[PDB]
């Protein structure tokens, strides 16, 4: 994660850093425009959802491999619940 | 309702929001020096003072900002 | 230049680090080729499983990266004027590694993409499904320990 | 404070506090705090005790990136 | 009192009955309002044609056949549903009432 | 971070390995990390055992 | 006749619901025709064995003749069940904990580990000030917003997403403090917390200008860091350390 910032970083906010202000100010806008939406869409996404079973699987199989000696049984315990059905 | 906002206005409003913000730390880091992004041996050098580019960026953001945000704030 | 550290002691650094990476990707990608596609016809049949069946492939995922922080680390110890003795272990080190996480791909891929099944009518059949899969990793960091040593012995030894 | 002594000495407020709140804590779910906050907080410690540089053997790393600022 | 059971794990009580039957529909609400239970039904070895209350849910059944055959000629027009009132205040909370 | 041996010269291990001298050779440390590690190497691989 | 009936429809729908569920209910029971007894089993809370006796209270003082109908009890030895709570607030912790597995009777159920537990870690993954900023800010309106939106539906993974803002906003908590703890907005450094290192002030455009240490800030890891490769070995050595001292 560290690189792949940093490597987007240099590419856009380096290239940014070129000095043309008169039609360049809409080269630089359009540079973070893009920019913007990379790092977070691309670059947070995919990267924390692959990211966090990683650590929820190790609990498991780091902890349960300690706790379950086995599995309970569900109660759920049950009354008068609304309910909606439309055909 | 003005102006529709159901056409990604939302979109528009934060990105134009957090395209200021930027502007304001880089013109910083540019009239100050940080020997981060002004003093380097590969550092571009136009003076550490290009702040003005990144101080007229500001303008065109906060105008579609505060349009969408006058359509949008029925909404609250 | 001279025997002890020639041009073409380097090419061992600037290869030899590259080949795990490779090995294991292509095991991991194997593995999912074989058991990602399991899923398809489980979760229609019964959505009920969906989080036991996805270890297996976060397992092949787990060997993956054996082989990158192997290159990574190795990554340091190469150069333009190191020893072709280095180049020498670090391209076994590397092999050895991503060839023996390639292996366990394979193995855990292979199992795997039949335990979604058996375990679609049985839901607590995972217990031995796990027993079973925890070896292909196993065996993967038993492929990747010795790297670690002889990378050790190439960040002192030279010459 | 930077020492040997730094994390001996600082290691024991937070078993006070603990053993404080541990006590004392809202009514309203009282033993959810008082079983987790006690983590909640040594975690906290712990991976702070680690970034703490002191005493150090390697060398530093070289800059390259000079201008006269 | 309050056991977090989260950080351990729970029980619940059985209870044999002896309730006679004479207080079996009228007393329905008691378990309906609130009952938060669940039970160990001990009708077993025979079935739903077998059992009682078959019967009955035959002739009921049909009233929901004819009320689902209703809602696509009442959405057949023009017109919405005001949705279930009573679903906003009858399913008030957990209530005895 | 308990000591430095190039602060005070002595001798030091690698930054991160002192593995092996535990497993192939019986209780020796070879890498001058502490006195009586000599001693309650072999211990601490022997207790292990049983 | 639709304007009349629809008002009254769908509440005749939610009754007929409501008595057949509570006749199947008493399906679940038995009968006999010569002695007035009926027979139903359900298990009751540990700490409830006092308290809906007094509920049975609620229903006798004119729905049944100071009827309980039965309180003496006779017990087996089927196991009883067991049950876990995510105390209305970390809903989606437990409920991802436990769908992994259960486990038995009276013991340490590992529900609350997780919360505290797997956010760092995640949180640890990347470590930004700027990336958990705006997935906090993300989780903030999401859960300011649930007043109203917990009502409409989403998409149907939409809709799980929605479920999770106690989860978001903690791991997102844990991301800004690791990310302030290596001083990267975006692998970027703002520290000002120099500490004393070897900096001479005489160097060539392109001399490897080292340094040495003359001073450490107590945390550490400041701007300094940020050199050549060097670095990078030092950071990646110290990282790896570090993540087998919490392992």
Redesign the interface.
Known sequence: HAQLSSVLWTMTIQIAFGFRGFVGVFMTVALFAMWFALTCAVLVLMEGTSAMLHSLRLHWVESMSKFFVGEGLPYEPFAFEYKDMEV | RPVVSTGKAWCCTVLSAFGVVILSVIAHLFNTNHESFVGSINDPEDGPAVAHTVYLAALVYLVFFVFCGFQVYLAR | MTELCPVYAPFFGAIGCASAIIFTSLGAAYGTAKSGVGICATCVLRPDLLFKNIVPVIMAGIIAIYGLVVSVLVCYSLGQKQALYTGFIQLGAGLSVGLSGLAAGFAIGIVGDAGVRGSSQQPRLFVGMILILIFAEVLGLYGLIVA??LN?RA??DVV | MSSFYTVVGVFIVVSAMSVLFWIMAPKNNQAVWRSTVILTLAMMFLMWAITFL?????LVAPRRSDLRP | EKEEAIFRSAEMALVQFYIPQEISRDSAYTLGQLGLVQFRDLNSKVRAFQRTFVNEIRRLDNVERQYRYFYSLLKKHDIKLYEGDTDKYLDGSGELY | ?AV????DGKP?P????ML?NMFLSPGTIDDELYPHQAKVQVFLLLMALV | ELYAIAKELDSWFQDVTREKAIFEILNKSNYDTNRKILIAEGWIPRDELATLQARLGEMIARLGIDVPSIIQVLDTNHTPPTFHRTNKFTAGFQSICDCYGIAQYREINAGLPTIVTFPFMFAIMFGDMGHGFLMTLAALSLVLNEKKINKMKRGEIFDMAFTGRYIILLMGVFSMYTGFLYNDIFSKTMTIFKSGWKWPDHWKKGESITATSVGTYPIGLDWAWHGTENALLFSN?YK??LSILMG
């Open positions: 670690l040593l050790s960040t002192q | 002191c005493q150090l053997h390697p | 971070w430095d041996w190039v602060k030091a690698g930054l991160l390995n092996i | 050595s790896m350390k």
